[PDB]
């Protein structure tokens, strides 16, 4: 529910003591958490919006030249005036021109002209800046419980909180007063100030499309500056990346507009994050967020809810997620009231032996009439298994053949750990529920390694770090005993390892 | 005289943007618009589940297609070593004053 078939979903251990777990949820890929007969609940970040942003430096990627100007002071008659060069809308490069009896001069030599042409602008690009103020997350909570198939894409049904609850999270209030009608609240507290490295990123805007930009890249662009804002036509700074005028054969000046730099800067961003912006309200995807969940206000809605012998007919044919779970949708044929429906995995007969693990805890029917559709997420054991639904005699079953070993799940978990510690860095080490000095050590070593690693190898992307990884691995194949022996397997491997899982 | 070798577009206008997906084992994605050859097409693998629509679960193909129309282009003409004329100005020092053009 909001997290079945959405893949790159992870699930974490449990409640582990304190009833207070940590998780770094993100924009794509969501987290189910499950803990010790409390309702399993999954959380997704979808749209982090930023309002109220200010405008640091702009850039003009087109030019509009006119009017030009000219000088022509004969040689050894001094330097030329051109009043327009006193005004700041005009651009000038004084050059030297060979002259003679042709060009209207008595003496021979260089004449020192400059055509000073009027710079103007059309279609600039803006570089709007954001601080952690006026920021927002809109996280969503979707407790498994009992919902239909049509109520897991259904965004509108959060107006009454059955299990769906949208929760607006701003960094001035980093706690989620998050009630879930039917049972108790959840109440997760966040750290939005340690977001996705904010106050280091700008919204770059060209024309109706916007993307995030690292600020050192942004200040290193050579185009005009437009430092504050857009009232009238501004004072354009630096004026030399654009309009280019030169001299050949001592005939006039080729004054070139130098055109339009959209594709130039679009090629120049290859590490940007596309956002979208509407009334300003710059909505943003690709964020991650370290909200730590607090349990113990959660409570299973009606653990009692008597067993309800009935007839179970499937609505839909059940399936099997790529994170090895099974999704079953039953009708219950409408006997009586809100009451529990048990399910089992059976390696034995049709009845009488449970294996595996139910994901959705306390699965239930909410309403009395004919077809209440409860969907169940289940976790079969690695071999063969049948599905048992409530009644000890009158029921319908399955077979699944899980098709993956426990060693395959361990390898998939290590590949997911590779992608975690590649994407989120040291912050990915905060999935494991609070570990005292264990995860504090495992976070401290990575935050004192990754800072120095960002200082050394921060400026290298896929193909330029493949080369250094290959070279340092070749060095570690042929060096001495000591430190440099354990250099390649720790560092060239970690370069190619941070490369090949970014995506892909 | 010139001969037109290749032309290179720049400013592309994109519309009609079609898209079609298939359940994770129901084949490759397709849409009629691919038979038009004015349109640009790529086929990515997306997720699919009950919360996506139809399928078993897993990853299914998704094509998206966009109209491609051009506004600015280079003509890119050819030069052959015939077909040209060099203009040479012969000028004799003598009875002439302050000339040069």
């Amino acid at each position, epitope marked *: 529910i909001r997290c079945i078939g959405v893949s790159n979903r992870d699930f974490v251990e449990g409640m582990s003591g304190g009833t207070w777990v940590d998780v770094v949820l993100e924009h794509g890929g969501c987290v189910t958490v499950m803990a010790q007969d409390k309702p399993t609940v999954d959380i997704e970040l979808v749209t982090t919006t930023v309002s109220n942003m200010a405008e640091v430096r702009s850039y003009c990627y087109e030019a509009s030249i006119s009017d030009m100007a000219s000088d022509s002071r004969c040689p050894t008659q001094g330097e030329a005036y051109l009043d327009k060069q006193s005004d700041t809308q005009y651009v000038c490069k004084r050059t030297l021109v060979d002259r003679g009896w042709g060009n209207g001069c008595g003496l021979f030599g260089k004449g020192s002209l400059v055509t000073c042409a009027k710079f103007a602008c059309s279609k600039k690009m803006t570089g709007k800046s954001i601080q952690p103020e006026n920021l927002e997350y809109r996280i969503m909570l979707s407790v498994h419980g009992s919902q239909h*198939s*049509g109520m897991i*894409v259904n965004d509108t049904g959060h107006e009454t909180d059955e299990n769906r609850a949208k929760v607006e999270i701003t960094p001035n209030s980093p706690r989620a007063e998050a009630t879930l009608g039917g049972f108790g609240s959840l109440g997760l507290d966040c750290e939005p100030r340690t977001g996705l490295d904010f106050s280091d990123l700008y919204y770059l805007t060209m024309n109706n499309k916007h993307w995030l930009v690292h600020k050192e890249w942004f200040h290193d662009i050579p185009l005009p500056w437009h430092a504050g804002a857009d009232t009238g036509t501004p004072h354009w700074n630096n004026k030399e990346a654009l309009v280019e005028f030169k001299d050949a054969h001592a005939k006039r000046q080729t004054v070139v507009v130098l055109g339009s730099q959209e594709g130039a800067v679009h090629t120049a961003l290859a590490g940007a994050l596309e956002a979208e912006m509407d009334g300003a309200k710059g909505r943003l995807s690709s964020g991650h967020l370290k909200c730590r969940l607090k349990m113990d206000k959660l409570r299973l809605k009606g653990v009692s809810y008597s067993l309800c012998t009935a007839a179970f007919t499937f*609505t*839909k*044919i059940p399936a099997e997620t790529l994170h090895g779970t099974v999704t079953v949708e039953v009708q219950y044929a409408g006997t009586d009231g809100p009451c529990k429906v048990p399910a089992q995995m059976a390696v034995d007969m049709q009845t009488l032996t449970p294996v595996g693990r139910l994901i959705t805890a306390n699965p239930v029917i909410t309403e009395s009439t004919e077809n209440s559709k409860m969907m169940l997420e289940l976790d079969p054991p690695f071999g063969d298994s049948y599905i048992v639904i409530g009644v000890g005699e009158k029921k319908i079953t399955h077979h699944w053949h899980r098709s993956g070993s426990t060693i395959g799940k361990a390898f998939e978990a290590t590949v997911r750990g590779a992608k975690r510690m590649a994407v989120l860095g040291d912050t990915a080490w905060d999935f494991g529920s609070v570990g005292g000095a264990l995860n504090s050590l495992g976070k401290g070593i990575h935050q004192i390694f990754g800072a120095a690693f960002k200082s050394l190898f921060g400026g290298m992307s896929w193909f330029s770090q493949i080369l250094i990884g290959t070279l340092l691995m070749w060095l570690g194949l042929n060096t001495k005993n000591g430190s440099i022996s354990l250099m390649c397997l720790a560092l060239g491997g970690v370069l190619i390892f941070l490369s090949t899982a970014v995506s892909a | 005289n010139m001969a037109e070798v290749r032309s290179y577009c720049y400013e592309a206008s994109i519309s*009609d943007m*079609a*898209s*079609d*997906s*298939r*359940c994770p084992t129901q084949g490759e994605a397709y*849409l*009629d*618009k691919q038979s038009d050859t004015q349109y640009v097409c790529k086929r990515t693998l997306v997720d*699919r589940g009950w919360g*996506n*629509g*139809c399928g078993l679960f897993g990853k299914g193909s*998704l094509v*998206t297609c966009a109209k491609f129309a051009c506004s600015k282009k280079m003509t890119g003409k050819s030069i052959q070593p015939e077909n040209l004329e060099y203009r040479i100005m012969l000028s004799v020092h003598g009875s002439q004053h302050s000339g040069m053009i």
Partner: antibody
Amino acid sequence: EVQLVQSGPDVEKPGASVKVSCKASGYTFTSNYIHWVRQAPGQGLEWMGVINPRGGSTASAQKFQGRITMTRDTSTSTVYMELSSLRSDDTAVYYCARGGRALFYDSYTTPRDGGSWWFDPWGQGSLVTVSS
Amino acid sequence: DIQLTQSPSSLSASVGDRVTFTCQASQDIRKYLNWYQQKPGKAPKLLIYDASNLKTGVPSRFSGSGSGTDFTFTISSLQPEDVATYYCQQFDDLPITFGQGTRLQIK
């Protein structure tokens, strides 16, 4: 209310192509598959094909392979059916009604149906007459 | 493609009668059949989705049943505004097939 409204009757020549519109009202246009269904005067109904108003995907019957193509307009919330290579057999009345479950893209059938499978918003029935 | 035979071709009955219609597919359609009545050249009146279910707004004199491939539509009480052409519709596999039709006449 939830309603599909079509264009008026058309008279076309054999060998030409006809275009029939189907505009939506009262519901989210990108949430219901538009099915096109023909009906000759005498012979009952016959399903021509299906478009998704999201993403403009199409499929159709085997009797119309290469003869029909369906386009969309998300702005005006309209569905266009262009039937080419017209014959005297194509003189009929054309209908368009929303399939319904139209989550992602194309026909979906092992998932749920019914509740105006497509039996609610049928515009009016565009008469298309192919003669000289 | 998934032939759908509709029996009979046309009927006639007086006001207040019970009448039944049969649709047989050549293939297994589970419970994927639907039922139309269409007044001639008009916006129709709604009978049955999913071969056994009425829709809200439909009067309860119409009913449908059928489990394997044979499906029975049933009007409990015929009324003078129930004269129409009656169709049944497959849902499975695609080339979605309709029945030929069933016309009624007021006696």
